[PDB]
Amino acid sequence: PNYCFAGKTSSISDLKEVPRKNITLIRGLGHGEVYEGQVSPLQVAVKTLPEVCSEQDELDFLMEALIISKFNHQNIVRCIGVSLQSLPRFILLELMAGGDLKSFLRETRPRPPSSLAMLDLLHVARDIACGCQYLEENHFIHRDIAARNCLLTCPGPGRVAKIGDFGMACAMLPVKWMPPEAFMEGIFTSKTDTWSFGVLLWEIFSLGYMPYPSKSNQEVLEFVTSGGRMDPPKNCPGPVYRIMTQCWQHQPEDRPNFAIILERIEYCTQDPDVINTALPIE
Numbered sequence: 001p002n003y004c005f006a007g008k009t010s011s012i013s014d015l016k017e018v019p020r021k022n023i024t025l026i027r028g029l030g031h032g033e034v035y036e037g038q039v040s041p042l043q044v045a046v047k048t049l050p051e052v053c054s055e056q057d058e059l060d061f062l063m064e065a066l067i068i069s070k071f072n073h074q075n076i077v078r079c080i081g082v083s084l085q086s087l088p089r090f091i092l093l094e095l096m097a098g099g100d101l102k103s104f105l106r107e108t109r110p111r112p113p114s115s116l117a118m119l120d121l122l123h124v125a126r127d128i129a130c131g132c133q134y135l136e137e138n139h140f141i142h143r144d145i146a147a148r149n150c151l152l153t154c155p156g157p158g159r160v161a162k163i164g165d166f167g168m169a170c171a172m173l174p175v176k177w178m179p180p181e182a183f184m185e186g187i188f189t190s191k192t193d194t195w196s197f198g199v200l201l202w203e204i205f206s207l208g209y210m211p212y213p214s215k216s217n218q219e220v221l222e223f224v225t226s227g228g229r230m231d232p233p234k235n236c237p238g239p240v241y242r243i244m245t246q247c248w249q250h251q252p253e254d255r256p257n258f259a260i261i262l263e264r265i266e267y268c269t270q271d272p273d274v275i276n277t278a279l280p281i282e
């Protein structure tokens with residue numbers, strides 16, 4: 001299997017094979033399965049392929065390794081290497097100690113008080129938008145920009161958010177992150193990623209709520225097609241909500257590219273009225 005990105009073609013032979021003897025598993029992290037690990041010492045996350053799997057599962061795994069290995073950006077998770085010549089097969093990734101963003105948001109929600117502030121949220125949004133701008137500039141369509149696919153380097157301040165999973169690149173389709181022309185026509189473009197980014201913003205500023213809270217997939221599809229959009233998250237500043245509503249323009253041509261999203265995020269970050277807004281206490 002071959003893979004091309006940024007005008008270069010790569011195959012399995014170009015991946016960095018790490019000797020199996022140099023890899024130590026430490027603990028499970030979530031769902032294949034992902035472990036904390038060590039490479040002789042580098043801390044890694046280890047994505048494993050079940051030994052019992054289809055040929056297409058094997059190929060899917062290979063492709064995910066080539067895709068992640070060829071990216072070179074600070075807001076995309078690094079691939080340390082692979083161990084594909086012993087079973088089970090491993091992909092070695094940068095350990096993101098802060099976890100997935102969805103869990104982080106849910107678990108770090110202000111409770112009775114200042115576990116998070118608005119600037120933390122804007123920094124995460126900026127980081128992911130920089131990641132997406134890098135993809136868009138390199139003509140890569142992610143297809144599943146969502147909080148569950150983003151990771152944080154560390155729990156505390158100085159955390160950096162990064163795009164972590166590239167699995168997507170009917171009942172399993174992430175309808176709630178997809179614009180009309182994607183779920184209706186199966187047309188994907190970089191404006192597809194813009195729409196999803198809008199939904200991720202909502203996830204961020206809601207502190208990890210499921211989009212379109214009470215609606216099923218079909219309800220969302222009919223709602224969104226008819227021009228329905230989500231309400232602002234609780235205490236969401238107007239300038240932030242305006243970015244969401246621009247990302248959710250019906251016409252792909254009317255949605256901003258990531259360079260523009262980034263500028264608008266940076267303007268929000270500069271506005272004292274935005275960053276002095278208190279997050280809701282649950």
Ligand SMILES: COc1cc(N2CCC(N3CCN(C)CC3)CC2)ccc1Nc1ncc(Cl)c(Nc2ccccc2P(C)(C)=O)n1
Pocket residue numbers: 029030031034045077093094095096097098099100103148149150151164165
């Ligand atoms: C310590 O590092 C982690 C911790 C957790 N946590 C988050 C809280 C969770 N909580 C604690 C509190 N408890 C009561 C309920 C559970 C426990 C696990 C999750 C993930 C990583 N790291 C990590 N790096 C790289 C990758 Cl690449 C990855 N990948 C990854 C790991 C897990 C899920 C999804 C992915 P993705 C996006 C789809 O690749 N994952």
